[PDB]
A paper describes a structure:
As a proof-of-concept, five peptidoglycan hydrolases from the Acinetobacter baumannii proteome (PHAb7-PHAb11) were identified using PlyF307 lysin-derived peptide as a template. To understand the catalytic mechanism and thermal stability of these peptidoglycan hydrolases, we attempted to decipher their structures and eventually obtained the crystal structures of PHAb8, PHAb10, and PHAb11 by X-ray crystallography. Despite their lower amino acid sequence similarity, PHAb8, PHAb10, and PHAb11 superimposed well with T4 lysozyme, especially in their Glu-Asp-Thr catalytic triad regions, suggesting that PHAb8, PHAb10, and PHAb11 may be phage-originated.
Specifically, the two asymmetric units of PHAb10 formed an antiparallel dimer with a rotation angle of 177.2° along the rotation axis and a distance of 10.5 Å between them. Structure-based homology analysis revealed that PHAb10 and PHAb11 probably belonged to the T4 lysozyme family and possessed the conserved Glu-Asp-Thr catalytic triad shared by traditional phage lysins and bacterial autolysins, namely Glu17, Asp26, and Thr32 of PHAb10, and Glu52, Asp61, and Thr67 of PHAb11. We carefully examined the topology of the PHAb10 dimer and found that it was supported by seven pairs of intermolecular H-bonds, with three pairs supporting the head, each two pairs in midbody and tail of the PHAb10 dimer. Specifically, in the top view of chain A, Arg20 and Gly27 were involved in intermolecular H-bond interactions, supporting the head region, Gly128 and Gly129-mediated interaction contributed to the stability of midbody, while Lys133 and Arg137 were involved in intermolecular H-bond forces anchoring the tails of the PHAb10 dimer. At temperatures above its transition point (i.e. >53.7°C), dimerized PHAb10 dissociated into monomers without precipitation. During the cooling process, monomeric PHAb10 refolded to a stable dimer via the intermolecular interactions between the two monomers, i.e., three pairs of intermolecular bonds at the head, two in the midbody, and two at the tail of the PHAb10 dimer.
Numbering used by the authors:
A (entry chain B), B (entry chain A): 22 to 168
Amino acid sequence: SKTTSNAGLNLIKGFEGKRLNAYDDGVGVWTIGFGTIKYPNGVRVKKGDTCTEQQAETYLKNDLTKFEVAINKLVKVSLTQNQFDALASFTYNLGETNLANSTLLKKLNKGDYQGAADQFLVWNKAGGKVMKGLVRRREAERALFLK
Amino acid sequence: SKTTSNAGLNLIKGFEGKRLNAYDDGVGVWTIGFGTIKYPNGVRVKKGDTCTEQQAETYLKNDLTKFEVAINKLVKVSLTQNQFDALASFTYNLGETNLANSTLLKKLNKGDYQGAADQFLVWNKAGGKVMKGLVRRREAERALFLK
């Protein structure tokens, strides 16, 4: 069973940004590193927390584990490491339920890799508006999937 | 018995957006207007459909009826219109079963309005992922509920 490799980690790190001081993510949930809100020991991130780059990467790798488990359970065809990494970014962003219900996964499990790759681009909306950042993200994920 | 007023309608329009051309939501469900997937005559939205803003408003008001019915059946205490509208947004987003089983409804039906208001905030997850947009929705619903 696969885990997220450096291609997927770099993708996600680019999207989350690097923040070594805890920050309000905009809705009052304190966050640090590359999108971490809870340390692997269960302690919640709080205002005033600081971390190192290595700690942030470890925390990201931990945050990914549940979504990696979901991908390994849900996908029933072979994946290149690039394809797994693209799905890890997609699923980290959108959650396991969106992956489980997606047309992407339906087509993927039929062996239709090209159709699945094109489904990444459908998920470009937040609040019904197409977001340029989500377009760029889905395009990067599709590009890695097809690499 | 109550129906959703302009306040709840604006809350829901906020996070559904407005799209007068039908679009795929990523799970193969074509969607139009303010999150409508089935017209009031039971006909499913399909690719190529278009509607006017007025039609979209009518369709959204129709979509809300099942959730309004659920709230009026499940809630056993008085509600201001603001509180009803907050619950309409919450239940539109999360569904009748989640409302029925919620600590939110349990506290509300004991007459514990402040406890219920605070329970809005725990419903900020999708597919194992805390979502900033969901936190925003829940905080807006709580604020309207408390107004």
